[PDB]
Amino acid sequence: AETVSFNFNSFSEGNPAINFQGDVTVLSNGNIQLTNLNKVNSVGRVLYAMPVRIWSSATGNVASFLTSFSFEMKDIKDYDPADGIIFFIAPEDTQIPAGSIGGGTLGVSDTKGAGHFVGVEFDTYSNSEYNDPPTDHVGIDVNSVDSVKTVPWNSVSGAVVKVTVIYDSSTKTLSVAVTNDNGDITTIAQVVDLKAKLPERVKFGFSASGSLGGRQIHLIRSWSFTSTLITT
Amino acid sequence: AETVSFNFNSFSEGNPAINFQGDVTVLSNGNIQLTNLNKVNSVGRVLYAMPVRIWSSATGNVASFLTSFSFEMKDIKDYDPADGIIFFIAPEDTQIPAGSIGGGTLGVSDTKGAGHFVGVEFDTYSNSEYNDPPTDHVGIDVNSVDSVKTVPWNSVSGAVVKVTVIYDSSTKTLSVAVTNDNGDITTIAQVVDLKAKLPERVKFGFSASGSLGGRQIHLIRSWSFTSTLITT
Amino acid sequence: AETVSFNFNSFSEGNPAINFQGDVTVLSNGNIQLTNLNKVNSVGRVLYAMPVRIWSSATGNVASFLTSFSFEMKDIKDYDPADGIIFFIAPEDTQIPAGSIGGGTLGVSDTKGAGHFVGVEFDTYSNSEYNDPPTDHVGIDVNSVDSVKTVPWNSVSGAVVKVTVIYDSSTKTLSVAVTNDNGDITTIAQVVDLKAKLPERVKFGFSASGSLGGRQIHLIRSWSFTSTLITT
Amino acid sequence: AETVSFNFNSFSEGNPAINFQGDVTVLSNGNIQLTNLNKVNSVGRVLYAMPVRIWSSATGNVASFLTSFSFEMKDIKDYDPADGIIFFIAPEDTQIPAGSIGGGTLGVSDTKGAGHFVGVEFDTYSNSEYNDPPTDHVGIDVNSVDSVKTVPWNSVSGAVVKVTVIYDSSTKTLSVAVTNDNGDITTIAQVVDLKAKLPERVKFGFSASGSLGGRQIHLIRSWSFTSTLITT
Ligand SMILES: OC[C@H]1O[C@@H](O[C@H]2[C@H](O)[C@@H](O)[C@@H](O)O[C@@H]2CO)[C@H](O)[C@@H](O)[C@H]1O
Ligand SMILES: OC[C@H]1O[C@@H](O[C@H]2[C@H](O)[C@@H](O)[C@@H](O)O[C@@H]2CO)[C@H](O)[C@@H](O)[C@H]1O
Ligand SMILES: OC[C@H]1O[C@@H](O[C@H]2[C@H](O)[C@@H](O)[C@@H](O)O[C@@H]2CO)[C@H](O)[C@@H](O)[C@H]1O
Ligand SMILES: OC[C@H]1O[C@@H](O[C@H]2[C@H](O)[C@@H](O)[C@@H](O)O[C@@H]2CO)[C@H](O)[C@@H](O)[C@H]1O
Ligand SMILES: [Ca+2]
Ligand SMILES: [Ca+2]
Ligand SMILES: [Ca+2]
Ligand SMILES: [Ca+2]
Ligand SMILES: [Mn+2]
Ligand SMILES: [Mn+2]
Ligand SMILES: [Mn+2]
Ligand SMILES: [Mn+2]
Structure with missing residues (x-):
């Protein structure tokens, strides 16, 4: 089988395994802070630098995956606690x-x-x-x-x-x-055909944003991932 | 919400939170051995002692749950490595x-x-x-x-x-x-209506067995569990 | 380590983790009312349904525990209030x-x-x-x-x-x-050897009571608990 | 009764209610990082600015207090995770x-x-x-x-x-x-006569340190405190 796995207990800029986009910043404690509290309409995203093959046009097989992560959101005086975090595949x-x-x-x-x-x-x-x-x-x-x-x-x-x-x-x-x-x-579950919605090679990541009056702390503390694609 | 949760990184005899049935034994290292390597058709089961209300006839709500556990199976001379372990709800x-x-x-x-x-x-x-x-x-x-x-x-x-x-x-x-x-x-997934197959109060546990010629070491090393039922 | 922990932010009837004795009633807001305002010498008790092993006869170790709870007592017209609440181990x-x-x-x-x-x-x-x-x-x-x-x-x-x-x-x-x-x-503290005063297995709970002339509202609003027993 | 109480769910530089000593720094997430990962023999301490009267020379009474806090320590590549955090009164x-x-x-x-x-x-x-x-x-x-x-x-x-x-x-x-x-x-408990060991007015706080080869992340996330001195 084709397996990809990684585990971050702390992050750091300069690590080639991760891509940073937008207002993202890495705190001295290893946490990832996705949005900039001092910017209007802030947007920050982080992605595992290596693309992962979720399905194969050759065999038609689709990968299964298990991933877990921990995050923290906190209010700041005095903006609306918004907008949130999203774990995405693209x-x-x-x-x-x-x-x-x-x-x-x-x-x-x-x-x-x-x-x-x-x-x-x-x-x-x-x-x-x-x-x-x-x-x-x-x-x-x-x-x-x-x-x-x-x-x-x-x-x-x-x-x-x-x-x-x-x-x-x-x-x-x-x-x-x-x-x-x-x-x-x-809990929440939904049937989603990744083969029909996404390309064979994708990137996994986290994104968060805010507005003018909507801001809050968006932190990613850890993240472990394992995907296995049967090649047969 | 009505939540039930527990965590076992190790087990010890006498813990009221656990129910033993059959040829179950607790090893000195805190691990649980489900079958007796010297008995014919050995059967051992461990259950969480407290009943869990997985669904309410008053509301019709069904609980969601998250559980993780680790086990180990090891061959012994000169018997067939059988029969296996089952995590069940009854x-x-x-x-x-x-x-x-x-x-x-x-x-x-x-x-x-x-x-x-x-x-x-x-x-x-x-x-x-x-x-x-x-x-x-x-x-x-x-x-x-x-x-x-x-x-x-x-x-x-x-x-x-x-x-x-x-x-x-x-x-x-x-x-x-x-x-x-x-x-x-x-991975493996299946839609199963617990409300249709089981009573409101059930027990969670593990079971293992062997036969005359089929025997192996069946060990449960850890078990964490959390179920949450929405009451409204 | 052998640990027992639970957290109740609200209570509901039918929850198997809780035992009711006497004139106990569960209000619609999730609060527990211990006594019956219309009964003479009313008594009500609520207990965590699972017995907790507070000490081991095998090792002689005694468990440590941390618990927090909130309650409320309110006068009624025009009885004496009378008599109070007790958090107990028995x-x-x-x-x-x-x-x-x-x-x-x-x-x-x-x-x-x-x-x-x-x-x-x-x-x-x-x-x-x-x-x-x-x-x-x-x-x-x-x-x-x-x-x-x-x-x-x-x-x-x-x-x-x-x-x-x-x-x-x-x-x-x-x-x-x-x-x-x-x-x-x-604050109040006292040295009490649980091992000498109680059996290995005990139950934790709250009790309240009143008399013919002494009555008041006794409410338990929340209760979290954690006990850890060193097994070795 | 003389009561002092405060609650911090996040900290900020410039808050006059707190004394910052040494290498302490406040992260954009509101956490207090006590030591500097880049300094040799780093020392950082935080104190509640207002001195607390723990005992009265007139009555001989000592105050009772209840405090709770959360912290986090994390290893860094590649130093010995040292030296630790201390909650102190001085x-x-x-x-x-x-x-x-x-x-x-x-x-x-x-x-x-x-x-x-x-x-x-x-x-x-x-x-x-x-x-x-x-x-x-x-x-x-x-x-x-x-x-x-x-x-x-x-x-x-x-x-x-x-x-x-x-x-x-x-x-x-x-x-x-x-x-x-x-x-x-x-848990751990010890009889400590505060009046014989400390002066009437003291400051409460946290401290942490590292050496040349011993360094780690020392973070204070939250802190609530209440002290009551019976004046009579
Ligand atoms: O309150 C947070 C939400 O703000 C919405 O946008 C606001 C904006 O923050 C404010 O400055 C003004 O322009 O009104 C807008 C309309 O509500 C965001 O659209 C929403 O996502 C939240 O961030
Ligand atoms: O070989 C393991 C399997 O044994 C099957 O039972 C055998 C038994 O072990 C043997 O002594 C003889 O009686 O024939 C039986 C039938 O094949 C079990 O049924 C199977 O579950 C395995 O344990
Ligand atoms: O005033 C409340 C106290 O009442 C005591 O019992 C009273 C009782 O209420 C009254 O009707 C009469 O019988 O005299 C009794 C003895 O004083 C309770 O003993 C006490 O616990 C309070 O509830
Ligand atoms: O390894 C952590 C401990 O270091 C001790 O100091 C070391 C120092 O880190 C090293 O660079 C060299 O100078 O030897 C010293 C003595 O072994 C600290 O004393 C101790 O508290 C830990 O931080
Ligand atoms: Ca939204
Ligand atoms: Ca089989
Ligand atoms: Ca009394
Ligand atoms: Ca030391
Ligand atoms: Mn939405
Ligand atoms: Mn089968
Ligand atoms: Mn009394
Ligand atoms: Mn020490």
Whole structure:
């Protein structure tokens, strides 16, 4: 089988294994801070530098993957705690949308909320322009921040959240488990055909953004990943 | 929300939080050995002592859960390495089937392979009477060891195996990610309506068995679990 | 290490992790009300359903534990309030004393004020028959409501009180910190050898009671707990 | 009663309510990083600016206090993870010792390991010169880093640790409860007469240090405190 795996317990600029885009910054504690609290419509994204082959045009096989990461969002006096973080998968040449307004676009979509990507968002502000639920929520996005499906969630300021994601190639099911600070878990799952939505080689990463009045701390603390593609 | 969670990095006799059934034994290193290498048709089961309410007849809500565990199977001279381990969910009154022949029933079913339980098996012997695939395999079992679905797998003697399971109540999807000793992952997912197959209160646990000629070391090394039921 | 931990931010009827005894009722807001305002000598107790092994006869080790909880007592028109709440530890088979007169026995002792339990009381009425101090008080009880030690305190009707308790196994010290609504803290500590006063397996819970003329609202709002026993 | 209480969920440079000493720095995420990873024998300390009156010379009374805080330590490539963090109480005019060598002195003592303070240390390196236990440990320090008492502990890189401390004036008992990342708790308690060891007014704070080859990330994430002195 074709397996790719990595595990970061701390990050650092200068590490060739990671690409940085936008206002991203690496704190002295190894944490990744995606947005710049002093910029309007800030957008920051981080990606595993090496593209991963999720499916094969030769065999038609699609990869299965297991990934978990931990992040932290915290309020700052005195802006609206927004907009959130999104774990995404996109073409290997993915870039921050030209003329990105950040905000509710989470740094992956245009003003209409469209883009080429599949992801799991941890959304902390309700943008009616993208049909968001009225509360904080976790959502599965397929080429749009107008989530295909969402589940109520609660973003606790300063709390460390743990996430586990499993993609089963056979059933094409993407299931997500979010462990909150207080111990409660939140789950959401959706059938998503990566073969039909994305190219053979993609990049995995995290993105976050803010607006003029919407800003908050977006930190990525750790990230382990393993994908296995059966080549037969 | 109604949440139940626990974490076992090791086990010790006398812990009220755990229920032992059959030939279970706790080793000095804190590991749990499920079968007795000197008994014919040995069967051993360990269960979380407290019943978990996976669904409420009052609301109709079903709980989501996240659990991870690690186990190890090791060959012994001069017996056949069998039969395997099964992580299962069963009614709270669950007991080792009367007159259990162990072996391919994995300690959860009758001679015909039927029983009242839902589980994930790590099967190391191919029983044609229960329509097993021709190789080692992971399977999703619903009231029978004749798996609803299986995926090829390989049990490596002495290898520590890590497993992660997510059950999403909304989609009723049970997804499993198995991390093999060599780094590759194996996944299998299946939609299973726990509310339709099981009572409101159930017990979670592990079971293993052997026959006269089939015996091996079945070890459970760790187990973390969290289920959250929405009460509203 | 053998660890038991749970966290209740709210309570619900039907949760198998909780045992109800006497006049206990679960309010729609998730709060637990211990006594019945319309009954003479009302007694209500709630216990964590699973017995906890606080010490091992094998090693002689005693567990350390950390627990915090919040409660509220509110006066009603026009009864005396009367009698209070007690956080207790007792044999796993503990039940409301037969023929309990409620009142100053706090639902845990007999008429003489004796019983089998260790606890921290938040006493709002002065029973001279149990040598109570003349004012509201917090006390450490060991097999009797005639406290081994008490400290002055003030029960404010309708005020949410937060409590933190630490039991250090090495020194066998039980320390309590009570945070009043006005920000002021009250502390009390006492050396109590749980190994000598209680059986290996015990249950933790809260009890409240009243009399014909003494009645008030006794509410448990939240409860988190963690006990760790060194096994080696 | 005289009560002092504050709560910090994040810190900021410029907040007059805090004294910054040495290499301390505040990250853009609100965390306080005590030591500088690029300096030899780095020492950084943070103190609550307002001195607290822990005892009255007029009444002989000592104050009781309840404090809880969370911190994080993380290894860096490639130095020994040292030396640790200490929560301390010292004279109001306390400053980092002149010519401090950092390292095992934890920033509060001279080369002999002596100083004027009382504290709880989270020690991650074993200094034989100060009679340290052979493993990571939590210790109670009274005017010396040669702990009056210690308990085995385990510092996990990148894990958030929660600590609760209660000081009971009557019994003069200082009890500590440490909640590790995996849920396990570690406790330690010791009778310490604050009035005989410290002056009437003191400052509370944190300190950390490193050596030439011993360095790690020492972060303070949050801190809540309440002290009550009975004046009568
Ligand atoms: O409050 C946070 C949200 O702000 C929205 O944009 C605001 C903007 O921040 C404010 O300066 C002004 O221009 O009004 C806008 C409309 O609400 C973002 O669109 C949203 O994503 C949040 O960040
Ligand atoms: O070889 C392992 C398998 O044994 C099967 O049972 C055997 C038994 O071990 C042998 O002594 C003889 O009685 O024939 C039996 C039938 O084949 C089990 O049924 C199977 O589960 C494996 O354990
Ligand atoms: O005033 C509250 C206290 O009442 C005591 O019991 C009273 C009882 O309420 C009254 O009706 C009469 O019978 O005299 C009793 C003895 O004083 C309780 O003993 C005490 O615990 C409080 O509840
Ligand atoms: O390895 C961490 C410990 O270092 C000790 O100091 C070392 C120093 O790091 C090294 O460069 C050389 O000078 O030898 C010293 C003595 O062994 C500290 O004393 C100790 O506290 C740890 O930080
Ligand atoms: Ca949004
Ligand atoms: Ca089989
Ligand atoms: Ca009383
Ligand atoms: Ca040291
Ligand atoms: Mn959204
Ligand atoms: Mn099978
Ligand atoms: Mn009393
Ligand atoms: Mn030390």
